[PDB]
DNA sequence: GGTCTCTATTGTCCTG
DNA sequence: CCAGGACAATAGAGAC
């Protein structure tokens, strides 16, 4: 296999559905900037009742138990 | 001038 | 299980 790839985190449910509403905002708003943006996000995310958010959970879950086969002794190093 | 850091958000995990 | 982090996706934007 391979030792110089490098392997992202997979990403929480909030990042599951911010992927998509990110750029559903980014048309709807086009001059703004990714910061704005992810203030935007933060405050519809507040705003979804826990029903809500389980679609986006349960697809958080299958990424992680996907990302687990790929990369099966897998440890979260942060840099410093 | 490519390449890296940073913004800004949440949830997840880490190392002190 | 606090305190202080890194870091997932995203393009803009500064720095070197």
Redesign the pocket.
Known sequence: GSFTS??????????VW??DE??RL?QQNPDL???????M???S??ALTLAE?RPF?EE?KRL?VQHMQDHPNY??????
Not at 6 to 15: D, G, K, L, S
Not at 33 to 39: F, Q, V
């Open positions: 490098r392997i992202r985190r997979p990403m929480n449910a909030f990042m911010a992927k990110r750029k980014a900037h990714n910061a704005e943006l992810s203030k996000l933060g405050k995310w507040k958010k959970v958080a992680r440890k979260y190093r942060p840099r410093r």
